[PDB]
Amino acid sequence: GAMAPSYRVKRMDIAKNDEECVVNAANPRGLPGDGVCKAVYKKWPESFKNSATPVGTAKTVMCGTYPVIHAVGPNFSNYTESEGDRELAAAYREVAKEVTRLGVNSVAIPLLSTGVYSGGKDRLTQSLNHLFTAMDSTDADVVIYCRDKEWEKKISEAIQMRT
């Protein structure tokens, strides 16, 4: 575990992370996809061997010795708000199980279901709060990756609020 487990936020491409493993915002079919998923496919394409997994789950595939945790959030275009919220919470719970099992001291994580799976809604707070619920009991250093300047400020504020 990390000496003093922390949360941090960075505004940059998660494919250039400085952590011991990465969480992909995957699709259920293990396809290259777009956004975070396409960046992850370009950087770790070996990790997409048998990476298909259902919504609300995470499946880890090694690229060399570097673990890629494929986490499948719900597409809110297809799910009800209620069922989508349950599957989004579940995906993060499965990420915490994998991070624990791998014994890593640090993980790079995107906000699941906040881009093309958002159903056109701002889900920063919803997604981040499910991330915290799952990861708070882990002792890995968590580094959240985002691309928008206003998102970086709001995520940083939420981290700092808990102290």
Residues making up the annotated binding site for ADP-D-ribose are: 13, 27, 35, 115-117
In three-state secondary structure terms, 68 is: strand
Spell out the alpha helix ranges (H) of the chain: 36-43, 81-102, 124-135, 149-161
Site membership for Cl ion, residue 148 (CB under 5 A): yes
CB-wise, 81 or 148, nearer to Cl ion? 148
Work out how close the CB of 156 gets to Cl ion at its nearest, in angstroms, rounded to a whole number: 13
One of 8, 13, 31, 154 touching Cl ion (CB under 5 A):
13
Cα–Cα distances in angstroms (integers) from residue 6 to residues 98, 116, 136, 143, 144, in the given order: 18, 28, 10, 8, 11
CA distance 63 to 46: 6
One of 72, 117, 124, 145 touching Cl ion (CB under 5 A):
117
CB-wise, 48 or 151, nearer to Cl ion? 151
One of 31, 115, 129, 154 touching Cl ion (CB under 5 A):
115
CA distance 114 to 14: 15
Site membership for Cl ion, residue 11 (CB under 5 A): no
Site membership for Cl ion, residue 143 (CB under 5 A): no
Site membership for Cl ion, residue 151 (CB under 5 A): yes
